């Protein structure tokens, strides 16, 4: 029952709203590579690391392992070789001029997320493609072992491995498979779901959905690098789109392929 | 002097985005990779083609009320300051959760709900099978970031089948059974699942007012605002059903 | 990207307003000739002057109405209300309609209230005396509209004739031309003053052409009051105005009707 | 929804009327 004219349009109710409002868009990465934790990263150009170490002039000319010698006969060194990449962002025209926001994170969260999805895909590809066969763990270079069930398989996988490489070993597998292993073991005994996964097998574990079959071995030998990047913007006038695009170069290879195995039932 | 709790809350505010921007527009597709891209999932081809690249946050009105009789004012108590803020703020929350999880939404606001339609219902033999199969359905990028919402009672029934005699998953958390985070809510009927990065909310403006109805002798405290919440991509969020 | 700043505004035209404006939504044509006043209480005499002994008897009419009504004339207050309604969303979308849209609205409401009552075919009760078609005016009869108007001028007293003015609808002014077509000549280009011999004003409400000395007809607005309020629940502001007026004919015998 | 008492009887709406009024 007042006479005043609210011309100002200043809002008093704003503070009543939740105090967690952003005023700027933010989000988490859309994808990530879970191999980056264990494996080695490098930026240097044209890398070569020899396979050999620890020569003895032994009269007992047995080397470490039979698989270790026959696949060193392949070659002495490994040389990472460049491969092409492409990343596209595509922010449209209305969004730029329609309202005042800030997208630098939206671009950043999109580009360097795209890198990780690439290198995980080819490195864990079921069916590789031309030029990319020499990085996928599921390529035929690496062995299968055969347990009766998947539990004893992984034991028989970690078993038939070098003493040394066993020490800093590491396992990859799906979580869904990891549950079936435990629902059968928990029968008539303690619960294991409250337990860490480090102990049922003895050594650390990482979970990813990609690994349709498990992996085992020491990923200090698996290596990645990136030569150098290229970044430029662009505008397509006839359509209105702005284009942010990235390209760099890379390769990833395993030093020795005997250090890694595949478990199977 | 008087004080009380939040009368109601919205569980969905934990994971969803929350914004205050006047007009809001974002792109739907974050990035596309190089030539060797297996064809984008049939779904995203359809919805992206139909909806378009952008997403519109469009204002929608409502009103929240509060009523204090006159005797209550003149009995030496201070409810003017706290009882109303406790009341109005709660009204904002219940308005959201009612619309999102609406079994049969009111007209003009169908597109907001998750059960309006346009989501695929997978079918598990039991609730345990339906949730795990629903994770098996959606795209893996959304899977890695996915979150489940459900009612707590359904989480009890899955334990009774996973009783397994001796072991008791009443003490276990729920993260480790399904493998992903969980949040419990009583309104969520059929367990829904997806990447709640994409789901988002925006409040543009408000206005606070007060007035006395002289004859009936009751003060009033009213507030209004405009919001909207939409799914950046419908193909993400999926249903579980028996 | 800095923002949506660009140089297109130069290419954009120059007629752009930057804020809202509009026309008078309605108007009262009768305000041209009639008097208009603001006086609180108003009283005037009906008869301006009388000459010496040699006056032929005053026209039978004026003897009657003057005898019945009395020498004076009473301007008596009568109420009405004008409204205006603006929803709340409209306020909070950065536009300025508070200042101009309402004045454009309320001022028009005053005008339509007048013209509705004066030219009312069947007036509302309590306000019969204002209208020109309530009754108490003589309807002459011409064979056509052209004959009826000219005969109506032939009826009323000559003093009123010399100052008389005609109001009518424009379409009827077309029909009189079709009979005065006369083949070759076309009075579409002619003004209307020269056909009938006196000024004319065009108005769509005026059914039967009326005529007389609009010196005598008069209006008065005594007082007003301006108010505003919010209906909190329904979320609409309001802007209301009120006033009191009245308009009367100093002498009914002047103003006459034309009819077919 | 105000508490004031218009005792003055000064009219604000006067200017809204047509400016051709005679007095």
Numbering used by the authors:
A (entry chain B): 129 to 393
B (entry chain C): 152 to 393
C (entry chain C): 134 to 393
D (entry chain B): 129 to 151
Pull verbatim passages from the article behind this deposition.
An icosahedral reconstruction of the procapsids from 28,566 particle images reached a resolution of 4.0 Å (FSC = 0.143). 3D classification of the data without the application of symmetry (C1) indicated that only ≈1% of the shells had portals incorporated, and no further attempts to reconstruct in C1 or C5 were therefore made. These procapsids show the expected T = 4 organization with hexamer/pentamer clustering, and at this resolution secondary structure elements and many side chains were clearly visible, sufficient to model with confidence the proteins that make up the capsid. Cycles of manual model building and real-space refinement demonstrated conclusively that the pentamers (subunit A) were made of Ccm while the hexamers (subunits B–D) were composed of CP. One striking difference is the exceptionally long, extended N-arm in CP, especially in subunit B, where the chain could be traced all the way from the δ domain cleavage site at residue 129. The Ccm N-arm is rotated by ≈80° relative to CP around a pivot centered on CP residue L163, and folds behind the P-domain where it points towards the interior of the shell. Other major differences include the E-loops; unusually, both proteins have an α-helix within their E-loops, but the location of the helix is on opposite sides of the E-loop hairpin in the two proteins. In contrast, intercapsomeric interactions are sparse and mostly mediated through the P-domains, which interact around the icosahedral threefold axes (formed by three C subunits) and the quasi-threefold axes formed by A, B, and D subunits between two hexamers and a pentamer. At the icosahedral threefold axis, the N-arms from three B subunits come together to form a triskelion-like structure. Our results suggest a model for size redirection in which preferential incorporation of Ccm pentamers prevents the cylindrical midsection from forming by imposing a constant curvature on the capsid shell assembly.
Staphylococcus aureus pathogenicity islands (SaPIs) are molecular parasites that hijack helper phages for their transfer. SaPIbov5, the prototypical member of a family of cos type SaPIs, redirects the assembly of ϕ12 helper capsids from prolate to isometric. This size and shape shift is dependent on the SaPIbov5-encoded protein Ccm, a homolog of the ϕ12 capsid protein (CP). All tailed bacteriophages (order Caudovirales) package their genomes into preformed procapsids made from capsid protein (CP), with a ring-like portal protein (PP) forming a unique vertex at one end of the capsid.
